[PDB]
Write a protein that binds this ligand. Structure first.
Ligand SMILES: c1ccc(Oc2ccc(Nc3ncnc4[nH]ccc34)cc2)cc1
Length: 294
């Protein structure tokens, strides 16, 4: 088949020494590199300069817009040449998709679920606040940090499928009649399935599906491969059934996101209160071990 975009061992811009490929899903590849200026390991994302769909221009735009914010990697560099385009950013640790799969039955406790969920909601409100939709909320786009000071922090890792949803000084942009969905079938909202323009609420639907999968270990459409068959299930599904294993205030969360549409700003403070109230009811404190620690 095709070789890796980068040969391990090469130096990018006389600074970043490529050490090992660490991922290859999506629209490119990701490497662990040594930054010889700062003398630290970093993540290096690359795409071929010839591939049909290139997303690192969006990655750089959103990463830069989010600098200073929580739950995002530090921006380190970027470039474009005849062979490849690249973006350099902070290296993180264990990926939530991997951590969930390491559990018995693929479930997290409500303690771990609520704390991760609240951090993920923070990260969604943050990207929305700078005028972008994520459009690809799924567990493999989040990781815990890899140091003592960062390993209790969850980071939003990738922005390739993002879209700017505001124009002028933060007016919502008129939606397109048709928008071809390129995200993940499992966590996609009904609107993605319908090839509708996605909104802020579609990222909150994907978070709702991730939280349910965290507590239950599976979604009702786990075994269905056909995208249209998944969409049909979601269109008809009584999402109240998913409240069974969530804390009671998730009825407020689900009622709220069900009420939303492309043109309606979410009540983020309401959704945050669901997590805050649930965490207090269950006596969860931030220092409690996550499931992978104990
Ligand atoms: C399912 C699918 C893919 C998968 O492998 C990943 C490898 C690296 C990443 N990305 C990152 N990792 C570590 N530090 C990072 N800073 C920026 C991005 C980044 C994400 C996933 C894990 C489970």
């Amino acid at each position: 088949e095709q070789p890796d975009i980068l040969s391990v061992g090469i130096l990018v811009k006389e600074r970043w020494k490529v050490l090992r490929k660490i991922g290859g899903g999506g629209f490119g590849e990701i490497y662990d590199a040594l930054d010889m200026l700062t003398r630290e390991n970093v993540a290096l994302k690359v795409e071929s300069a010839q591939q049909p769909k290139q997303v690192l221009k969006m990655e750089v735009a959103v990463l830069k817009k989010l600098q200073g914010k929580d739950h995002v990697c530090r921006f380190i560099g970027c470039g474009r040449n005849d062979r490849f385009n690249y973006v350099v950013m902070q290296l993180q640790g264990r990926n939530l998709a991997d951590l969930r799969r390491s559990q018995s039955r693929g479930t997290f406790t409500i303690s771990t679920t609520l704390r991760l969920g609240r951090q993920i909601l923070e990260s969604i409100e943050s990207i929305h606040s700078v005028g972008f939709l994520h459009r690809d909320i799924k567990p493999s786009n989040f990781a815990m940090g890899r140091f003592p000071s960062t390993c209790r922090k969850c980071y939003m890792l990738d922005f390739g499928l993002a879209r700017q949803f505001t124009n002028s000084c933060g007016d919502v942009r008129p939606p397109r009649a048709v928008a071809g969905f390129r995200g993940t079938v499992r966590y996609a909202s009904i609107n993605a399935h319908r090839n509708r323009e996605m909104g802020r609420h579609d990222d909150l639907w994907s978070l709702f599906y991730m939280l349910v999968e965290f507590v239950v270990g599976q979604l009702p459409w786990r075994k269905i491969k056909d995208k249209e068959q998944v969409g049909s299930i979601k269109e008809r599904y009584d999402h109240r059934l998913m409240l069974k294993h969530l804390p009671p205030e998730f009825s407020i969360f689900l009622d709220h996101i069900s009420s939303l549409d492309y043109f309606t700003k979410p009540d983020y403070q309401l959704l945050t209160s669901v997590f805050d109230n649930s965490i207090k009811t269950f006596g969860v404190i931030e220092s409690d071990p996550f499931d992978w620690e104990k």
